[PDB]
Design an enzyme around this catalytic site. Structure first.
Site, PDB file in Angstrom:
ATOM      1  N   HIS A 276      -7.144   1.577  -6.582  1.00  0.00           N
ATOM      2  CA  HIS A 276      -8.356   1.280  -5.829  1.00  0.00           C
ATOM      3  C   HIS A 276      -9.156   2.587  -5.799  1.00  0.00           C
ATOM      4  CE1 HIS A 276     -10.002   0.238  -1.508  1.00  0.00           C
ATOM      5  NE2 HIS A 276     -10.954   0.586  -2.355  1.00  0.00           N
TER       6      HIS A 276
ATOM      7  N   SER B  62       0.864  -1.176   0.000  1.00  0.00           N
ATOM      8  CA  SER B  62       0.000   0.000   0.000  1.00  0.00           C
ATOM      9  C   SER B  62       0.900   1.225   0.000  1.00  0.00           C
ATOM     10  CB  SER B  62      -0.885  -0.007   1.250  1.00  0.00           C
ATOM     11  OG  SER B  62      -1.686   1.154   1.315  1.00  0.00           O
TER      12      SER B  62
ATOM     13  N   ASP C 249      -4.095   3.775  -3.458  1.00  0.00           N
ATOM     14  CA  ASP C 249      -5.400   4.226  -2.989  1.00  0.00           C
ATOM     15  C   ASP C 249      -5.771   5.618  -3.477  1.00  0.00           C
ATOM     16  OD1 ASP C 249      -4.820   2.454   0.074  1.00  0.00           O
ATOM     17  OD2 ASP C 249      -6.207   1.940  -1.539  1.00  0.00           O
TER      18      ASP C 249
ATOM     19  N   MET D 269      -8.673   8.240  -3.040  1.00  0.00           N
ATOM     20  CA  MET D 269      -9.855   8.621  -2.296  1.00  0.00           C
ATOM     21  C   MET D 269     -10.468   9.960  -2.690  1.00  0.00           C
ATOM     22  SD  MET D 269      -8.434   7.117   1.299  1.00  0.00           S
ATOM     23  CE  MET D 269      -7.819   8.701   1.529  1.00  0.00           C
TER      24      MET D 269
ATOM     25  N   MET E  45     -12.307  -5.936   1.779  1.00  0.00           N
ATOM     26  CA  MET E  45     -11.882  -4.981   2.796  1.00  0.00           C
ATOM     27  C   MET E  45     -12.074  -5.710   4.123  1.00  0.00           C
ATOM     28  SD  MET E  45     -11.058  -2.109   1.390  1.00  0.00           S
ATOM     29  CE  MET E  45     -10.888  -1.185   2.935  1.00  0.00           C
TER      30      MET E  45
ATOM     31  N   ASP F 250      -7.563  -6.550   1.943  1.00  0.00           N
ATOM     32  CA  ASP F 250      -7.172  -5.171   2.215  1.00  0.00           C
ATOM     33  C   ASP F 250      -7.593  -4.737   3.608  1.00  0.00           C
ATOM     34  OD1 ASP F 250      -7.769  -1.960   0.521  1.00  0.00           O
ATOM     35  OD2 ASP F 250      -6.481  -2.526   2.209  1.00  0.00           O
TER      36      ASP F 250
ATOM     37  N   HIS G 291      -0.241  -1.215  -4.719  1.00  0.00           N
ATOM     38  CA  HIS G 291      -1.600  -0.846  -4.334  1.00  0.00           C
ATOM     39  C   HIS G 291      -1.682   0.663  -4.135  1.00  0.00           C
ATOM     40  CE1 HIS G 291      -5.639  -1.612  -2.943  1.00  0.00           C
ATOM     41  NE2 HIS G 291      -5.428  -0.803  -1.920  1.00  0.00           N
TER      42      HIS G 291
ATOM     43  N   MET H 109     -11.753   4.653  -4.408  1.00  0.00           N
ATOM     44  CA  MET H 109     -12.690   4.938  -3.328  1.00  0.00           C
ATOM     45  C   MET H 109     -13.262   6.327  -3.587  1.00  0.00           C
ATOM     46  SD  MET H 109     -10.654   3.490  -0.053  1.00  0.00           S
ATOM     47  CE  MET H 109      -9.050   3.487  -0.903  1.00  0.00           C
TER      48      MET H 109
HETATM   49 MG   LIG Z   1      -7.215   0.172  -0.591  1.00  0.00          MG
END
Ligand SMILES: [Mg+2]
Ligand SMILES: [Mg+2]
Ligand SMILES: [Mg+2]
Ligand SMILES: [Mg+2]
Ligand SMILES: [Mg+2]
Ligand SMILES: [Mg+2]
Lengths: 219, 219, 219, 219, 219, 219
Positions: free
Chosen positions: C63, C6, C32, C34, C135, C173, C30, C65
């Site tokens: 990912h 991550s 993220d 957001m 998750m 995750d 990975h 989000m």
């Molecule tokens: Mg994630």
């Protein structure tokens, strides 16, 4: 096999003639009402419903692809809608209230699921629907890729109706054309929402277009 | 004194004839595109614009009463719009970007203020507008109460144009009829958006209707 | 047992060295992304993806989000993403459309469920995923309480894959560390997204950190 | 003439060296924090601020281009921000409350106006700002068209400061480069937020890049 | 058979006497907290909770009909709430986080489903609830039509509890009165939320009202 | 000098007595109705208005701190409101429509500005208000820091009224107490909204509290 022409695909230059032809040949008028939010597009509205009402005897079915369907029920009833098709994904917390309001206005109840919504979503009120529609394409536009996976949904919907002793009609929305007629009927479809690829596009003249469509449905 | 008929007030049964008549008599086609969110209603859309385009030579002016005008510029250009009228209250943070996009599509720029928005709202980009419109009624529907207070806005807009040496046309939207023609012209209006009360309602036949309106404007 | 570090947990002071180390030791990056809306936080973005792309050969997995994943697919592809992991709870009404767009850009498809979303949510398109992530903590931040209940989800996901003859990899995750490695593998995990507690935190030097992590995975 | 490098334009491969160079040469670190909603993009975040904090002595200025600035004040203070620059268009109804919270965390107050927002917007709290920034381009991305009309805003801001006996610094954000340095200084700018066109782009090596920029500012 | 009076139905003129009576006769105080957004109405709030706290020993149960339940947990705990009843449809992505926060404040956990939400919605955290409530009417107002279909939900909830060896109480919310007491108990209800039709309306004096209600429950 | 007690600050244990006392001593009942969205809090509602109506002769003034004031006018009228105070920042695009609806229900019109909203915001409809209120604190809670800068707003509002020959009363909302009475009267206040610090807090008994407040106003 009932037919419901998608009016967002009609020719306004021949508005009066196409509506009259459709009114004496089809079973329903499919009127798409979009939000620009629930789906990324804008098409028809109460104004359009009101105009079609002037020469219609067949039921006007308003598919509510809007964030707040509660805002259009009274207005659509006054414009002359006969059917109000609701998206289960927009009525959590108010499905029963809206269904009652729809019937208080003497309109029929429709329920429409987009691709990723399972039939169980309607389990507590599926018995209040006169017609249940299956989107065979993500909502919003005409001419999108057919989603084969939806055939199982049509079937499940038919099995559910039989097993529960219900009487709702099963409708299909999205790329209903020569390439899908057969599979759709086999899956359990009762009504075909026909748009540009399935109807209007076959001939500039709607009589010829309808004849061609009718012939293709034969198989 | 230019005229811009509000198409959300037309008769679709006589679509072709009304558009052709309007195209050879009016200066602009006023096409309302609503969100259901920026204003509580739904009327016309790109589809409609596309149909009117088939027989139009006069400019199609799309009034964007939507939360996200950015989502419709390319689509409206492709449908055949010639004018894109933006609400300053929906473009803070993107007015210059959108105005550039509008011109990259060879379309003219319109700016429209609803009742409670002051002209200064557009001070940094007012010089980029071909036409500036004043809502004389809170947006959304036809047949609402005229707002006299808006007369000062029309005047201020005219003084601003002169003082700054600009060339934008001043348009009026909302209850433009016999009861307001005089005051509006006196205030500084250059263009009248005429709807049901000012045009369509005078006679079932649009020629006769246009005659009555024109006569009333005379005074 | 594949590893996916991550990056929101990495040390930017040693950006180049950590990315190069990770690129020659891990299976995925990975990343993220957001919204501040779908989850209450902000971390990485296309900019970040673009930088990691400069020295990466392993696939960059973004990912999403965010409330509107549709807004980032083209931009992320352009930045160099190889995988786009979508939240089923943000694609109702557009899952098939987005999955097609993702593949149109030659990127792989990922699906990620937060704690309270059941696997059936993906039943109509689960077969289009290359990787499905679970998750094990409500999304948004690092260092939150592991959710044991999610073990059943991992298992169900494995049984579904076998029963349906699918080939998607199962990823985990959220708090993947010494305290959970065993249970996660037993449950059916194929890929571990490792963050601060599972990797970076073991040693200021990433080689040593990775060594310790690898050893702990042994059990 | 103070300088504030836009970190969303830096090279992460040389993170440590560029931050150290900037820390000993610039006056502020300009850290853009976007929502994906207030502006259509995603760039930096608290995580990023936290990393820059490791080697910074100069103040970290976080420009909050987010819908809910209230959600980031404590978190940003915690990550090490020194300046919180608020958009007046996102604080109506909470400007005083937020400004107090910012100072309760021992951070300085910044106010930033996008193109279409007039200076009066801040009239009731303009005296609480340590720095006021003028967007010279609609917010969201780097490399957009400079907006000349903004020069008057810079001037007005300078006149206001003098007339009211205030001490805030005037900053410029958006296409600050060789083509605009002169006009901006003449207009009243005190600080330059320099991005790709004004700094980073002049040389792959930041020392050389900075040398060139400084020379260009000379004129 | 436990009783939980709906305070949005009480008489504020006799606030002190009704609360004291209820505190020594009922099992819970049902306090509705509405958003105006999740449901179209506004009723009680933390302020109210705080007042009832002055003379209460029985647990105050706050039903959160709001879009952002995360915003009220600390504030409600402070006002004196003992139970926080969450809507599963408002906690996707934060159910476990919120449940933990509720317990850090030493409050009990409640889960409430509106008509169209299935029990599986809570499958991954149903075991963390002290009480689970079933809306027998779309949320928002008092005096709406009872939804018989909800009887199956009560039953399913009872079977689930037994089959999984859980200990949560089953509560009913919506038109709990003489016409529904029997069916509700038969279905599996443990607690009755009584409002105007079931309690307050039987007599201007609450002692007499409570007597009549108790007698009706007998059957 | 008129008084308007903030009911969100009253003691419900002595509801009946406090309302009766207030009804025979004050000029208005200040009832705060919050959204949880327009301001981050929830206080009173139509239910509350309805209860106060039982023993009131003085006008009930509902301050609408909600996103959609349009949703509460009919309901509030029904509950017994006499005054509806609107936030200009929530009525752009519908101010005239709402003001008309308010009067169609025979209620008076109130306009309330929070700290950062200038008086010009109401320039086109300021003459339709019976009372104009100035927030002297960012809206939402009681006991927040007084905002001195608002004194100029009160003055400007008084000058505007005189210069335009209007008759609206000028009200103050926010920390109206001994520390601000003088400055507020000097600035131009006609009505004081008194809450916990200005009234209720002076004595557990409201007679004594009012006695003390009245005496303090003397200076
Ligand atoms: Mg994630
Ligand atoms: Mg449709
Ligand atoms: Mg218009
Ligand atoms: Mg910036
Ligand atoms: Mg309730
Ligand atoms: Mg108030």
């Amino acid at each position: 096999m009932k037919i419901s022409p998608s009016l967002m695909c009609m020719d306004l230059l021949k508005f009066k003639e196409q509506i009259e032809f459709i009114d004496s040949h089809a079973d329903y008028f499919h009127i798409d009402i979009m939000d620009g939010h629930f789906v990324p597009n804008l098409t028809l509205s109460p104004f359009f419903v009101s105009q079609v009402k002037k020469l219609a005897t067949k039921p006007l079915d308003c598919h509510l692809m809007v964030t707040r369907p509660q805002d259009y029920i009274a207005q659509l009833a006054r414009a002359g809608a006969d059917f109000i098709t609701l998206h289960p994904e927009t009525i959590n917390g108010q499905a029963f209230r809206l269904i009652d309001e729809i019937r208080r206005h003497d309109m029929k109840v429709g329920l429409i699921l987009n691709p990723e919504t399972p039939v169980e979503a309607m389990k507590y009120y599926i018995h209040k629907a006169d017609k249940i529609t299956v989107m065979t394409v993500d909502p919003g536009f005409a001419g999108q890729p057919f989603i084969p996976e939806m055939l199982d949904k049509l079937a499940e919907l038919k099995a559910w109706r039989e097993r529960e002793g219900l009487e709702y009609e099963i409708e299909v929305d999205g790329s209903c054309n020569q390439a899908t007629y057969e599979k759709l009927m086999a899956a359990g479809a009762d009504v075909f929402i026909v748009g540009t690829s399935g109807l209007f596009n076959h001939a500039e003249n709607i009589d010829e277009a309808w004849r061609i469509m009718t012939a293709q449905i034969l198989a």
